[PDB]
Amino acid sequence: FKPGVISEELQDALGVTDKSLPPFIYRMRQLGYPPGWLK
Amino acid sequence: EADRTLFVGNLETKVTEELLFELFHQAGPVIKVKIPKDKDGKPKQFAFVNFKHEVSVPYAMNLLNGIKLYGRPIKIQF
Ligand SMILES: [Br-]
């Protein structure tokens, strides 16, 4: 599980311009570590 | 007895099962994503995301609801 690492197909779907900007990591830091990955 | 299924709607037509798999994989391990068919075999505008664990469902709701895919914000009603 590598958070915010996504494929090029998903980047185009998300509309991400810059591949070095990790998506979803900012909010995960707030929500906490996804519980379904702990187990 | 545990419900690990999410209903996600308002999907743009280009959204695929593999695309949703990778996206919801961020919220937790995903088992499968199914986009049901119409009476003429047409894909519907919603999908079922089945997680390995129930706890992944509320988390994905907060993390991923409203995210725009191809300009269309997904709606996670489940
Ligand atoms: Br986000």
Numbering used by the authors:
A (entry chain D): 286 to 324
B (entry chain A): 7 to 84
From the paper:
From the pull-down assays with the corresponding protein constructs (lane 6), we could demonstrate that ZCCHC8285–324 (encompassing the proline-rich region downstream of the Zinc-knuckle domain, ZCCHC8Pro) is sufficient to bind RBM71–86 (spanning the RRM domain, RBM7RRM). The complex between ZCCHC8Pro and RBM7RRM yielded crystals diffracting to about 2.85 Å resolution, with seven complexes in the asymmetric unit. To obtain experimental phases, we co-crystallized the complex in the presence of heavy-atom compounds. Co-crystallization with Samarium chloride yielded a different crystal form diffracting to 2.0 Å resolution and containing a single copy of the complex in the asymmetric unit. The coordinates of the Sm-derivatized RBM7RRM–ZCCHC8Pro complex allowed solving the structure of the native complex (Rfree of 30.0% and R-factor of 26.2%). As the two structures are very similar, we focused on the highest-resolution atomic model, which includes residues 286–324 of ZCCH8 and residues 7–86 of RBM7.
In the nucleoplasm, however, hMTR4 binds the RBM7 and ZCCHC8 proteins, forming the metazoan-specific nuclear exosome targeting (NEXT) complex. NEXT promotes the exosomal degradation of non-coding promoter-upstream transcripts, enhancer RNAs28 and 3′-extended products of histone- and small nuclear RNA transcription. We conclude that ZCCHC8 is a scaffolding subunit that bridges the interaction between RBM7 and hMTR4. In this work, we have shown that RBM7RRM binds a proline-rich segment of ZCCHC8 at the back helical surface and is able to concomitantly bind RNA.
